[PDB]
Design an enzyme around this catalytic site. Sequence first.
Site, PDB file in Angstrom:
ATOM      1  N   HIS A   1     -13.552 -78.489  17.959  1.00  0.00           N
ATOM      2  CA  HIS A   1     -12.562 -79.140  17.190  1.00  0.00           C
ATOM      3  C   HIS A   1     -11.850 -77.777  16.367  1.00  0.00           C
ATOM      4  O   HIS A   1     -12.356 -77.013  16.048  1.00  0.00           O
ATOM      5  CB  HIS A   1     -12.678 -80.024  16.207  1.00  0.00           C
TER       6      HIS A   1
ATOM      7  N   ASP B   1     -10.748 -76.815  13.460  1.00  0.00           N
ATOM      8  CA  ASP B   1     -10.938 -76.486  12.214  1.00  0.00           C
ATOM      9  C   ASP B   1     -12.546 -76.151  12.464  1.00  0.00           C
ATOM     10  O   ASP B   1     -12.673 -75.065  11.845  1.00  0.00           O
ATOM     11  CB  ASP B   1     -10.763 -77.730  11.376  1.00  0.00           C
ATOM     12  N   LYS B   2     -13.236 -76.598  13.221  1.00  0.00           N
ATOM     13  CA  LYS B   2     -14.537 -76.456  13.236  1.00  0.00           C
ATOM     14  C   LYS B   2     -14.814 -75.253  13.996  1.00  0.00           C
ATOM     15  O   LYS B   2     -15.661 -74.437  13.668  1.00  0.00           O
ATOM     16  CB  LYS B   2     -15.386 -77.679  13.804  1.00  0.00           C
TER      17      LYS B   2
ATOM     18  N   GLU C   1     -11.992 -65.971   6.084  1.00  0.00           N
ATOM     19  CA  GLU C   1     -10.993 -67.132   6.603  1.00  0.00           C
ATOM     20  C   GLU C   1     -10.846 -67.028   8.099  1.00  0.00           C
ATOM     21  O   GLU C   1     -10.616 -65.792   8.430  1.00  0.00           O
ATOM     22  CB  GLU C   1      -9.879 -67.490   5.733  1.00  0.00           C
TER      23      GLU C   1
ATOM     24  N   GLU D   1     -11.796 -61.125   2.558  1.00  0.00           N
ATOM     25  CA  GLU D   1     -12.377 -59.826   1.835  1.00  0.00           C
ATOM     26  C   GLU D   1     -13.906 -59.747   2.349  1.00  0.00           C
ATOM     27  O   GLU D   1     -14.582 -60.728   1.866  1.00  0.00           O
ATOM     28  CB  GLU D   1     -12.054 -60.084   0.381  1.00  0.00           C
TER      29      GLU D   1
ATOM     30  N   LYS E   1     -13.491 -85.769  18.454  1.00  0.00           N
ATOM     31  CA  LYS E   1     -13.447 -86.414  17.007  1.00  0.00           C
ATOM     32  C   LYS E   1     -14.102 -87.828  17.357  1.00  0.00           C
ATOM     33  O   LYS E   1     -13.868 -88.483  18.311  1.00  0.00           O
ATOM     34  CB  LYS E   1     -12.073 -86.610  16.408  1.00  0.00           C
TER      35      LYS E   1
ATOM     36  N   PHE F   1      -5.594 -86.771  26.481  1.00  0.00           N
ATOM     37  CA  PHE F   1      -5.798 -85.844  25.515  1.00  0.00           C
ATOM     38  C   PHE F   1      -6.525 -84.682  26.498  1.00  0.00           C
ATOM     39  O   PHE F   1      -7.439 -84.204  26.366  1.00  0.00           O
ATOM     40  CB  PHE F   1      -7.179 -86.429  24.588  1.00  0.00           C
TER      41      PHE F   1
ATOM     42  N   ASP G   1      -3.618 -78.113  18.183  1.00  0.00           N
ATOM     43  CA  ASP G   1      -3.508 -78.282  16.785  1.00  0.00           C
ATOM     44  C   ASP G   1      -4.064 -76.989  16.049  1.00  0.00           C
ATOM     45  O   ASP G   1      -5.180 -76.701  16.405  1.00  0.00           O
ATOM     46  CB  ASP G   1      -4.278 -79.496  16.474  1.00  0.00           C
ATOM     47  N   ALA G   2      -3.341 -76.268  15.204  1.00  0.00           N
ATOM     48  CA  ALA G   2      -3.924 -75.136  14.684  1.00  0.00           C
ATOM     49  C   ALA G   2      -4.992 -75.318  13.819  1.00  0.00           C
ATOM     50  O   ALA G   2      -4.852 -76.615  12.900  1.00  0.00           O
ATOM     51  CB  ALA G   2      -2.905 -74.802  13.674  1.00  0.00           C
TER      52      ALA G   2
ATOM     53  N   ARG H   1     -11.288 -77.017   6.439  1.00  0.00           N
ATOM     54  CA  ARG H   1     -10.389 -78.063   6.574  1.00  0.00           C
ATOM     55  C   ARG H   1     -11.278 -79.324   7.110  1.00  0.00           C
ATOM     56  O   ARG H   1     -10.563 -80.435   7.570  1.00  0.00           O
ATOM     57  CB  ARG H   1      -9.077 -77.640   7.471  1.00  0.00           C
ATOM     58  N   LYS H   2     -12.507 -79.174   7.018  1.00  0.00           N
ATOM     59  CA  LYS H   2     -13.366 -80.394   7.478  1.00  0.00           C
ATOM     60  C   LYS H   2     -14.424 -80.636   6.164  1.00  0.00           C
ATOM     61  O   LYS H   2     -15.617 -80.707   6.731  1.00  0.00           O
ATOM     62  CB  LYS H   2     -13.990 -80.284   8.882  1.00  0.00           C
TER      63      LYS H   2
ATOM     64  N   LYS I   1     -18.466 -67.647   3.539  1.00  0.00           N
ATOM     65  CA  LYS I   1     -18.799 -67.313   1.979  1.00  0.00           C
ATOM     66  C   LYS I   1     -20.406 -66.888   1.851  1.00  0.00           C
ATOM     67  O   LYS I   1     -21.329 -67.923   2.392  1.00  0.00           O
ATOM     68  CB  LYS I   1     -18.384 -68.494   0.993  1.00  0.00           C
TER      69      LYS I   1
ATOM     70  N   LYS J   1     -20.552 -67.205  -3.913  1.00  0.00           N
ATOM     71  CA  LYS J   1     -19.353 -68.100  -4.003  1.00  0.00           C
ATOM     72  C   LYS J   1     -20.192 -69.468  -4.221  1.00  0.00           C
ATOM     73  O   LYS J   1     -20.610 -69.937  -3.237  1.00  0.00           O
ATOM     74  CB  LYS J   1     -18.636 -68.076  -2.692  1.00  0.00           C
TER      75      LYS J   1
ATOM     76  N   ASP K   1     -18.950 -72.130  -4.440  1.00  0.00           N
ATOM     77  CA  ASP K   1     -18.608 -73.404  -3.453  1.00  0.00           C
ATOM     78  C   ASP K   1     -19.421 -73.926  -2.576  1.00  0.00           C
ATOM     79  O   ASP K   1     -19.838 -75.168  -2.320  1.00  0.00           O
ATOM     80  CB  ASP K   1     -17.308 -73.049  -2.761  1.00  0.00           C
TER      81      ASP K   1
END
Lengths: 380, 380
Positions: free
Chosen positions: B14, B16-17, B42, B55, B166, B235, B243-244, B249-250, B270, B274, B276
């Site tokens: 996928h 994003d993955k 990123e 960074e 998905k 598909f 799809d970008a 985003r997941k 990260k 971080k 997060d």
Amino acid sequence: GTFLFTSESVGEGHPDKICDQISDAVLDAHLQQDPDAKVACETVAKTGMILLAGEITSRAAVDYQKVVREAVKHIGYDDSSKGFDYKTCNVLVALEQQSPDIAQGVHLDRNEEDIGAGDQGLMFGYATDETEECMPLTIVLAHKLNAKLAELRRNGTLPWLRPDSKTQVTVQYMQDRGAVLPIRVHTIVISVQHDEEVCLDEMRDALKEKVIKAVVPAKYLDEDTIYHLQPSGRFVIGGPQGDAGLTGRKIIVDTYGGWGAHGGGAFSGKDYTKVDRSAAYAARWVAKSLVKGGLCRRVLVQVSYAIGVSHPLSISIFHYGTSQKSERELLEIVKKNFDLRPGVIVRDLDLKKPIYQRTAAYGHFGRDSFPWEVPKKLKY
Amino acid sequence: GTFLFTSESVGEGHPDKICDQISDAVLDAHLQQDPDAKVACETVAKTGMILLAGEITSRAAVDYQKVVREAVKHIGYDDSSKGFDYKTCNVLVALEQQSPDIAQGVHLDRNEEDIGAGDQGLMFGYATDETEECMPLTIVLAHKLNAKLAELRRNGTLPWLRPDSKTQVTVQYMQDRGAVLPIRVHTIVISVQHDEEVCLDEMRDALKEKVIKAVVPAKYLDEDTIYHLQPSGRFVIGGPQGDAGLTGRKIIVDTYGGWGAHGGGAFSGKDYTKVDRSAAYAARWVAKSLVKGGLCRRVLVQVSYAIGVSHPLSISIFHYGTSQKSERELLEIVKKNFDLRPGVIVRDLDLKKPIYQRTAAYGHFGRDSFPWEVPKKLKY
Ligand SMILES: C[S@@+](CC[C@H](N)C(=O)[O-])C[C@H]1O[C@@H](n2cnc3c(N)ncnc32)[C@H](O)[C@@H]1O
Ligand SMILES: C[S@@+](CC[C@H](N)C(=O)[O-])C[C@H]1O[C@@H](n2cnc3c(N)ncnc32)[C@H](O)[C@@H]1O
Ligand SMILES: CN(C)c1nc(=O)[nH]c2cc(Cl)ccc12
Ligand SMILES: CN(C)c1nc(=O)[nH]c2cc(Cl)ccc12
Ligand SMILES: [Cl-]
Ligand SMILES: [Cl-]
């Protein structure tokens, strides 16, 4: 019964938020010419760069250079001294048409009311009677602190401010049979990009006196409130130069600040067929309608879809114990009053209108009486 | 008392993955040489392109072209017929050093145990006794369906499969004083990229017989279960071409599938400073320790930070009514047993180890006995 809860917000020049705003400026530009534009515009920002990547099928003629640069100008990045300049940054475009495989499975040759969901996924709506706008106080205050920074920057009161900012508010609550009652503000964080000349003490004093006191009612602040103002000590480098930004990386700031739940989808840069946005807006509309209709004090709504299928696959309600009605009864009232097919949501919420850039900072909910904020009168 | 709940998952290919995995491959490459690398990588993916933006300050010598291409190879995008090829795609790099303003405010000249949080923010941990691994059944099943697709693709059983997929699972639950009990599977969605030659009926039959039946216990499936298999009908175009994708985003697929809550932060790309990532891992560790320690059947934990400050600003507990102890008592037990400073979490959870690419698909939690999955024995 007391507990703490924390939410954050970010300013218009936070690099992730810059991407959301640009993505929505692109969407609006398309919708102004083609109300049926299929848009899936991701934005990436790093030093000197705005990159658009994604898929757009539209009859509009959009000048991406102009649209991107105007959005950056609005945000306030207009000089190399601030770390980013709309006049001189690089704007790169990697935009293709929508996949024909998606188009044929979602909307081609489909009656609009019967269009399929643009993707599978899950979405939540939430509302709480703790504020008139039915939003958590933690995130409302966090948003207003960023808005205040931008206001003081734009009016020249604090000319050392730059557009990139973050805020975070911890509220101490009491609870009453599942509803939540704010008592006081326990901790506030503010970090904001600034010029090379202003000292830390001048900034901390202005942040307390001109920002926090101008936003947060004094009744919530006391001798024990903790203030973390410019806690990193220096924030001259900022915007995309300090941290790469991407569309859809502030989805909790966009929604409920940790309260309720999230299905994962980003809102910005997507037309109504992408249920990540439209169904989340409709679920907010349902939740707010249940609270303003006096059926519950706070509530969470889940909906889900399959790509190409119009009707939701599931709908669920969690009322936190704040209704005399069971969750089964509330679900029946929701199914009798709402039709969450995307081709009906578009009509109820007027989702072809180019108002999306307005949603892309300060949260999508609890502001400006957008259609999803106007409760539906319920029949049962 | 019955209700529905839906969660989704996505495959390794996928888009994003793919970005999360590449971001974590970069992180691991740095950590293999410099355990103290500061990484904020990123990734963006679109047709023929992997862009790294962010960074990194590190003493490692990392060959980004090699690291990115090897991650894409592992995923299985190795030919233009599949829509993406590690051998011939563009790899673009926009990586700068970490902002010195961040570095000085977070970690420079700081004792490791006393390092500041790398950012402000909020994070949640969640655990539920509905599965042995203390994860929601909805998302466990959704992850296993994607893993099964990748297994059948890699072993050549279903050679028409491609890496992008998905899945989505709706479970009908009962509840018992706040705990949740799965009854049956109400709806399953599977969409997977495929070759030009296989027909829809062959795919739908294989998805039901070789994928769903190989994963979901028959006791959960009945005559009323709804199956949406290849619901878009076609598909062939997939991966970044369809799809970008972007890192982070997941975040709901990475965590709890709509259950519990999320603070908004992305994990991949990260290092431990971080919060997060590190504080979300620690909050999962706390939640799982409370459930495996028999203090509650399910629980949600919030933590929050300010940039540059080591101790959390707040900690909160929501036990859904599943403990005899109050949330105040559970919070006291948490504060007596855990130290959620990032410079202590790194030691407890061994967060300088380069195991991050392993976390970047199929969820970060409930698998492989990572340190945050091994409960802490509680004293009270
Ligand atoms: C701290 S950065 C994320 C970590 C960063 N990518 C790194 O390389 O360490 C996240 C956000 O914090 C804010 N930020 C940037 N520089 C900062 C500083 N010196 N002090 C405080 N906040 C800062 C900006 O809003 C930025 O988008
Ligand atoms: C449907 S796409 C998001 C919308 C898309 N950006 C557009 O332009 O309409 C989201 C994900 O769905 C999957 N997908 C892509 N093409 C698909 C298709 N033809 N049928 C079903 N799922 C598809 C991929 O996993 C992709 O990353
Ligand atoms: C136990 N039940 C009823 C739930 N438990 C949660 O944790 N969250 C929910 C969210 C929705 Cl939208 C519906 C039900 C639930
Ligand atoms: C009413 N209380 C106690 C809460 N309400 C929520 O909606 N979620 C919470 C999440 C945490 Cl981590 C702590 C408290 C709460
Ligand atoms: Cl951020
Ligand atoms: Cl997606």
